[PDB]
UniProtKB/TrEMBL annotation, chains A, B:
Record's protein name: AbrB/MazE/SpoVT family DNA-binding domain-containing protein
Key words, A-Z: Plasmid
Highest taxon, organism lineage: Archaea
Length: 56, 56
């Protein structure tokens, strides 16, 4: 998947999002109550964004 | 941090997103054409969503 990038009026106020596909979200029971801790790590010498579910 | 949940009619026809903080996005040079491969793992015994960049 490609990143989901949103903008406002002011230049440089853009925000970035990664999608959670429906069936993966459904299989994981992901809800608006969940909390994630984000780490940056290496997977196969490539850059990885890891969201660890910490709450709910 | 929490998920960015957007639209839905309620029935699991919702969409789920995880935010990349702007300066992590900037430090990784994230642009709209980057490609990410989503994998699901355990970290400290908790579910982790890992997004590996597979194309810049």
């Amino acid at each position: 998947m490609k990143p989901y990038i949103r903008r406002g009026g002011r230049p440089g106020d853009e925000t970035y999002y990664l999608n959670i596909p429906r069936d993966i979200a459904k299989a994981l029971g992901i809800t608006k109550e969940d909390e994630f801790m984000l780490s940056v790590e290496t997977k196969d010498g490539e850059i990885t964004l890891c969201y660890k579910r910490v709450k709910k």
